[PDB]
Amino acid sequence: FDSTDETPASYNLAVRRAAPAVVNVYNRGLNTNSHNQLEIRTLGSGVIMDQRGYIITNKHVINDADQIIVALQDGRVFEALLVGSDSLTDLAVLIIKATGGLPTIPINARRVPHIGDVVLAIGNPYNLGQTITQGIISATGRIGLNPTGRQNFLQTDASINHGNSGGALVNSLGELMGINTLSFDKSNDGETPEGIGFAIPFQLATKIMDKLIRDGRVIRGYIGIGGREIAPLHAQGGGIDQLQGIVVNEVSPDGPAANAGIQVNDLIISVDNKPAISALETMDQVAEIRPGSVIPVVVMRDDKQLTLQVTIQEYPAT
Amino acid sequence: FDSTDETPASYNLAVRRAAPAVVNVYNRGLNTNSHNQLEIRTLGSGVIMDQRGYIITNKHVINDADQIIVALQDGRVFEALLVGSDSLTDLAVLIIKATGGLPTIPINARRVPHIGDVVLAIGNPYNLGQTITQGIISATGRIGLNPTGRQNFLQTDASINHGNSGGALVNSLGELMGINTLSFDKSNDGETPEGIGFAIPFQLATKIMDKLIRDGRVIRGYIGIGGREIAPLHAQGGGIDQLQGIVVNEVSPDGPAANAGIQVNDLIISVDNKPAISALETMDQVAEIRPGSVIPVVVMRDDKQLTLQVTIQEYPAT
Amino acid sequence: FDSTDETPASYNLAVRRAAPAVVNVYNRGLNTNSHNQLEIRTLGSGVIMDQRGYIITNKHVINDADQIIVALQDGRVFEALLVGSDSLTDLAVLIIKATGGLPTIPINARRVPHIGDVVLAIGNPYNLGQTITQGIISATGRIGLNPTGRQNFLQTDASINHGNSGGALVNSLGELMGINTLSFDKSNDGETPEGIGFAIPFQLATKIMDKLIRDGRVIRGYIGIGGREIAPLHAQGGGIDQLQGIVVNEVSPDGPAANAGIQVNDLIISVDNKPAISALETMDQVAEIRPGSVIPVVVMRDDKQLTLQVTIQEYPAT
């Protein structure tokens, strides 16, 4: 009978701290039919990353824009400069030149996201203004730039929507956990799954932002090798006293490893002075190495250690 | 190892306080094929609003009923009188004559719903008896009766279902936040969206109930004008010293404004002594004014203030 | 500005206590096209029930396996023996012979699941490793083995998926509340509903496990009678002073009741010395009675009490 003095369970604190940094992003076209001007071709969410005015949204919200417009919850509207984008992650960065003072996403670089943590997925879009949803972290993501990985997304059961994808995934304190990404069949804002949605983990989103600001695109390194891990894996003892490694299957012809030269069954033990313990770790490592770089790769060949010297190239198209 | 003395996180308190007021609503037909009697043509949820026995459900659960039956969780069954309904909101009110004492929905007219608050959507229906779901408020709704608005629904990610729609949306204390409404493609109990569901905000649901009890239907006022707001909007300073207003586009021919008479480019500054600051506010205001009413409308016409006097009519069909 | 010392709302405690008992279950076939070996025909989740190595998964994950493989989160892999299964519940039990010490699901036989309690649905499967989701208990289930019941499932809005169904439903303390069951259209791992998902309640899952370990299958008793409850039901007074009972409709011909012999309108008042108060209770009771058993059934026939003696048979195919 006395609700009066009680307090409803709520996540409005996360909302108050994070939402003013989450922006409407508009993709405007100039028509060809009757004379021209101001058509909205699509609409999406973006997140203000720093003072200075860099913003992340989805590449799919900005593709083929003639002009990119940004509107804040406080009423200010800006025209945006496209800094660059990346297909594999569906992220783009924009920049805005502003008037004394922007609201920014809270970010805690020391926070470790845990499976089971509560998250809110904050956008705007639909009926009017804002869709916000609640769920949990289902699976932590990896932070790699390797173009074949399938585990570089945090997964959540918070609904991720067209009113969702360009925006912020945050925990109950309003700290950024990831960038919302509409979730896996193709062409601006509605999908097939249900249950599970995806975001770019925030330390990956930050990495990719710094890459775009500095090169205009995500430059990924490449070694030109396919292969599987030798010694049977896991069970933390069972045991220690034999060296792991990557047996080589495939050597891209006229790839960096082929040049150099490296042959099918010869067993990679070390790459750029790190032990080659896992196929997956090692291809993420190679991906961050700048092209033009010369690195040592140690192999065992006929019971002998060879050190070859390899010059990294860029991962090549599609 | 010691779960024994701990307490599981739970919303069962909201359930215990609110659920006994949430009722099964049955729509029974008399057949035409073999001889007649007792067929259930559809089934839905309703909410007991006050002692006295008024109940809200969905119009779609009650349309074309020959007889309306109500069953409580405590075993009592009643036949219901249809008091009236409204298509635009998909609400209907019923009344029941009862035996000493009904369980009623807790309602707190002082509570302000916040974006991020936890809500449970309580029904009965399917497999047997009750579907209850949990989510958050995604967007607060407006409380207007203007028939073109698209923001008069609270939005939630709690699942809203056929076992859901006639019932109560409540917060963690069991206070009513809204009426569940199945959610946007047509004909008794299953839908297309996912992600986002809808309810009538509770102060709108209460308003519409009092309207039905007193007139048998929702009588909406009408002025017979389409138009857009002049001076560029928002940013809380930028600035103060010029009067907002509604420029007139369209004047319904032989509508109230046309009678009176009011012409295309002439700029509404005030309606029924309230400043005309926003298109949306002003059309909600007109909607609550009783038909037959004579009100002053101030315009600026050729740099001159005219006051016309306008007699409100009812908003007309479909 | 100070997130630093605060703590994010989270269910990671339930995860840490329950997840190490939730296993990958693989169904491997030997090919017929090119020469043979190791194909994965489907993949699912299972739950370790006790030391000793009994595991529950879904019957649908194991059907037609040539070999059943089990992988723990700690890296250990086992080959599994199929102990038995049950179509009506989509459960199977497996057994594994292990090396000093298994992680087991926490189970609290004294805990009473409440409508509104938070639950996590823990699996592994998809992109890589784990899907976990969060929701509430929507409806408590019954624990009966009667093959026509439709209320023997707990219902939840936690998403239940292919990365879900063989695994554990648990509350915020990590205690087992039920077995996840993909949720109602047919053939290994994706569905039609949305909103509502299903699990076997844990006291039913335990019952069915003990039955499989001891007989290799779920043996259900049968009486060979269809019928409805006499005196109008519910409202806890209204009143006490007349005996409930089951009027008999239908008597399976050459069923146990027919033998014995029992006739259409004659009114069951007691079964195996329990009052026959409810159709549903009484058919669950009959289902647990072992076949071969001789029990008294009291009826009222022409205002007279007859006691017949009935020998229970097994419920017969499909």
Alpha carbon distance, N-terminus to C-terminus of chain B: 64
The β-bridge relationship of strands C221-222 and A22-30 is: unpaired
| The three-state (H, E, C) secondary structure of B161-204, written as one string | CCCCCCCEEECCCCCEEEEEECCCCCCCCCCCCECEEEEEEHHH
| DSSP string computed for A224-267 | -EEEEE-S---SSSS-SSS---EEEEEE-TTSTTTTT---TT--
Q: Is C151 on the interface with B (CB under 8 A)?
A: yes
To the nearest whole Å, the CA of A90 is away from the closest chain B CA by: 21
Question: Residues B125, B184: contact at Cβ < 8 Å?
Answer: no
Tokens 């309810």, residue located: B199
Among the listed residues B134, B133, B162, the one whose alpha carbon sits nearest the alpha carbon of residue B58: B162
CA A149 to chain centre: 12
Gap between the Cα atoms of C288 and C314, Å rounded: 10
Q: What is the resolution of this structure in A?
A: 2.2
Which of C45, C85, C165, C270 is flagged as catalytic?
Answer: C165
Q: Residue B80 forms beta bridges with which residues?
A: B68
Among the listed residues C195, A77, A7, A296, the one whose alpha carbon sits nearest the alpha carbon of residue B133: C195
Among the listed residues A295, A312, A296, the one whose alpha carbon sits nearest the alpha carbon of residue A252: A312
- Neighbours, chain C (3 or more CB pairs < 8 A): A, B
Both structure tokens of C294: 């001789």
Tokens 């999908």, residue located: A191
Q: Is A151 on the interface with C (CB under 8 A)?
A: yes
What number of other Cβ atoms are within 10 A of residue C40's Cβ?
10
Gap between the Cα atoms of A287 and A222, Å rounded: 6
Nearest to C127 among A151, A173, A175 (CB): A151
Which of B85, B86, B162, B165 is flagged as catalytic?
Answer: B165
CA angle B229-B235-B239, nearest 5°? 75
What number of other Cβ atoms are within 10 A of residue B258's Cβ?
15
Both structure tokens of B153: 């629904």
Contacts B9 to C, Cβ<8 Å: 11, 117-118, 171-172
Q: What is the DSSP letter of C261?
A: -
C317: three-class secondary structure by DSSP: coil
Host H or E run for residue C202: helix C202-215
Way it was determined: X-ray
Nearest to B3 among C106, C153, C236 (CB): C106
What number of other Cβ atoms are within 10 A of residue A129's Cβ?
14
Gap between the Cα atoms of B11 and B173, Å rounded: 9
Gap between the Cα atoms of A132 and B119, Å rounded: 13
Nearest to A132 among B11, B110, B115 (CB): B115
Both structure tokens of C161: 């998926």
Gap between the Cα atoms of B23 and B54, Å rounded: 12
Gap between the Cα atoms of B92 and B101, Å rounded: 22
Chain A interface, best mutation among B155, B184, B240, by max A CB count within 10 A: B155
Question: Residues C67, C85: contact at Cβ < 8 Å?
Answer: no
Among the listed residues A190, A43, A29, the one whose alpha carbon sits nearest the alpha carbon of residue A128: A43
Cα dihedral sign for B162, B165, B167, B169? positive
Gap between the Cα atoms of C157 and C142, Å rounded: 18
Q: Is C173 on the interface with B (CB under 8 A)?
A: yes
Contacts A158 to B, Cβ<8 Å: 157
For A160, C163, C183, C318, the CA distances from C189, given in Å and listed in that order, are 22, 8, 9, 23
Among the listed residues C199, C275, C187, the one whose alpha carbon sits nearest the alpha carbon of residue C231: C275
CA C173 to chain centre: 22
The residue in chain A having the minimum alpha-carbon distance to the alpha carbon of residue C15 is: A116
Supply φ then ψ for residue A283, to 5 degrees.
-75, -30
To the nearest whole Å, the CA of C89 is away from the closest chain B CA by: 15
For C48, C140, C261, the CA distances from C204, given in Å and listed in that order, are 16, 12, 33
CA C171 to chain centre: 18
- Would the CB atoms of A130 and B114 count as touching at under 8 Å? no
Question: Residues C215, C279: contact at Cβ < 8 Å?
Answer: no
For A140, A231, C96, the CA distances from C126, given in Å and listed in that order, are 13, 25, 24
Both structure tokens of A31: 């028509």
Cis amide bond preceding C221, omega within 30: no
| DSSP string computed for chain B | --GGG----B-HHHHHHHGGGEEEEEEEEE-SSSS--EEEEEEEEEEE-STT-EEEEEHHHHTT-SEEEEE-TTS-EEEEEEEEEETTTTEEEEE---SS--------TT----TTBEEEEE---SSSS--EEEEEEEEPPP----TT-S--SEEESS---TTTTTSEEE-TT--EEEEEE--SSSSSS--S-BSBEEEEEHHHHHHHHHHHHHHSS---EE--EEEEE-S---SSSS-SSS---EEEEEE-TTSTTTTT---TT--EEEETTEE---HHHHHHHHHTSPTT-EEEEEEESSS-EEEEEEE-EEPP--
CA angle C222-C227-C229, nearest 5°? 120
C60 is catalytic: yes
Alpha carbon distance, N-terminus to C-terminus of chain A: 64
Tokens 């500005």, residue located: C1
The CA radius of gyration of chain A, in Å to the nearest whole number, is 23
Which domains does chain B possess? Answer: 1-97 (2.40.10.10), 116-201 (2.40.10.10), 219-318 (2.30.42.10)
To the nearest whole Å, the CA of B200 is away from the closest chain C CA by: 20
What number of other Cβ atoms are within 10 A of residue A212's Cβ?
20
Q: What is the DSSP letter of C173?
A: T
Q: Is C155 on the interface with A (CB under 8 A)?
A: no
Cis amide bond preceding C261, omega within 30: yes
Gap between the Cα atoms of A254 and A261, Å rounded: 10
Question: Residues A169, A177: contact at Cβ < 8 Å?
Answer: yes
Gap between the Cα atoms of A31 and C167, Å rounded: 54
Contacts B132 to C, Cβ<8 Å: 115-116, 136, 138-139
Q: Is B127 on the interface with C (CB under 8 A)?
A: yes
Question: Residues C165, C104: contact at Cβ < 8 Å?
Answer: no
Both structure tokens of C214: 């001891």
Gap between the Cα atoms of A28 and A284, Å rounded: 37
Supply φ then ψ for residue C45, to 5 degrees.
-105, 155
Q: Residue A58 forms beta bridges with which residues?
A: A91
Residue burial C285-296, b: 16+ Cβ < 10 Å; e: rest: bbbebeeeeebe
- Would the CB atoms of C234 and B75 count as touching at under 8 Å? yes
Question: Residues B97, B227: contact at Cβ < 8 Å?
Answer: no
Q: What is the DSSP letter of C192?
A: S
Q: What contacts 24+ positions apart, CB below 8 Å, involve A183-187? A: A187/A60
Residue B235's Cβ-side half-sphere holds a number of Cα atoms within 13 Å equal to 12
Question: Residues A48, A176: contact at Cβ < 8 Å?
Answer: no
CA angle B61-B64-B68, nearest 5°? 60
Residue burial A23-48, b: 16+ Cβ < 10 Å; e: rest: bbbbbbbeeeeeeeeeeeebbbbbbb
Which of C90, C162, C183, C266 is flagged as catalytic?
Answer: C90
B225 is in an annotated binding site: yes
Gap between the Cα atoms of A29 and A42, Å rounded: 9
Both structure tokens of B152: 């008069």
Q: What is the DSSP letter of A43?
A: E
Gap between the Cα atoms of A63 and A28, Å rounded: 11
Count H helices, E strands: chain C? 4, 20
Nearest to A117 among C12, C74, C159 (CB): C12
Gap between the Cα atoms of B137 and B115, Å rounded: 5
C226 is in an annotated binding site: yes
What number of other Cβ atoms are within 10 A of residue A245's Cβ?
21
C8-37 residues touching A, CB cutoff 8 A: 8-15
C114 is catalytic: no
Gap between the Cα atoms of A40 and B202, Å rounded: 34
A105: three-class secondary structure by DSSP: coil
Largest separation between any pair of C-alpha atoms in chain C: 83
B96 is in an annotated binding site: no
Cα dihedral sign for C300, C306, C312, C317? negative
The β-bridge relationship of strands A22-30 and A67-71 is: antiparallel
Q: What contacts 24+ positions apart, CB below 8 Å, involve A292-298? A: A293/A221, A295/A271, A296/A270, A296/A272, A297/A257, A297/A260, A297/A262, A297/A268, A297/A270, A297/A271, A297/A272, A298/A268, A298/A269, A298/A270
Both structure tokens of A244: 């792991």
Residues in chain B: 318
